[PDB]
From a paper:
FLASH, Flice-associated huge protein, was originally discovered as a protein involved in Fas-mediated apoptosis and later in regulation of expression of several genes, including oncogenes. Subsequent studies showed that FLASH localizes to Histone Locus Bodies in the nucleus, suggesting a role in expression of histone genes, and that it is essential for histone pre-mRNA processing. Our crystallographic studies of FLASH NTD demonstrate that residues 71–137 adopt a continuous and stable α-helical fold and mediate the formation of a coiled-coil dimer between two FLASH molecules.
To rule out the possibility that the observed FLASH NTD dimer is a crystallographic artifact caused by oxidized cysteine residues, we determined the structures of the FLASH NTD C54S/C83A double mutant in two different crystal forms at 2.1 and 2.6 Å resolution, respectively. In addition to Cys83, we also mutated the other Cys residue in the FLASH NTD, Cys54, in case it formed a disulfide as well even though the residue was disordered in the structure. The two structures adopt the same coiled-coil dimer as the wild-type FLASH NTD, confirming that FLASH NTD dimer formation does not require the Cys83 disulfide. The individual protomers of these two mutant dimers also show differences, similar to those observed for the wild-type dimer. Interestingly, residues 53–70 from one of the protomers in the structure at 2.6 Å resolution are stabilized by crystal packing, showing strong electron density corresponding to an α-helix. This protomer appears to form a single long α-helix from residues 53 to 137. The other protomer showed weak electron density for residues 56–62, while residues 51–55 and 63–66 are not observed. It appears that the helix for residues 53–70 does not dimerize, and it may also be structurally independent of residues 71–137, even though a single long helix (residues 53–137) is observed in one crystal form. Whether the flexibility of this helix is a feature needed for binding the HCC will need to await further investigation.
Residue numbers in the entry:
A (entry chain B): 52 to 139
B (entry chain A): 56 to 63, 67 to 140
Write the structure that this text describes.
């Protein structure tokens, strides 16, 4: 019966192994999901950061364009009056 | 009949199922890291650019204020010698 005795010991030895490989997979899966959750929370942060950065960036581009134009016009009104005084 | 039980099975199919799930999770994670580093890079670019614009605006106001006042002095002096 030692061929059957070995057969039964074999079935359980392979069963113990496959269940422990499965167990390992279940654990590594959950670990990975924890990892994901953390990175997702970090990602949402820099994305919101990214959102306000672009907003600030657009407004600054607006402002520095507007201030240039209002300045160049304000200096032209000067140069025009100077010419008129040079013309009187 | 020996090994027919262990060969024939849902124990190993559900292992495969989860193994596929675990693989997908990893790839989803690798894709997320990619997007993260991409968005992060933009922020470093935006932070850099924004701070230099604020400085540029400041420098702009200063030289504008100076040149305008200078023209204004020219105008005063013109009336005076007139």
């Amino acid at each position: 019966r030692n061929s059957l005795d070995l057969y039964e010991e074999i079935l359980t030895e392979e069963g113990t192994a496959k269940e422990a490989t499965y167990n390992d997979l279940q654990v590594e899966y959950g670990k990975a999901q924890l990892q994901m959750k953390e990175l997702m929370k970090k990602f949402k942060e820099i994305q919101a950061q990214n959102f306000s950065l672009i907003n600030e960036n657009q407004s600054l581009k607006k402002n520095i364009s507007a201030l240039i134009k209002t300045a160049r016009v304000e200096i032209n009104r000067k140069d025009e009056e100077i010419s008129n005084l040079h013309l009187e």
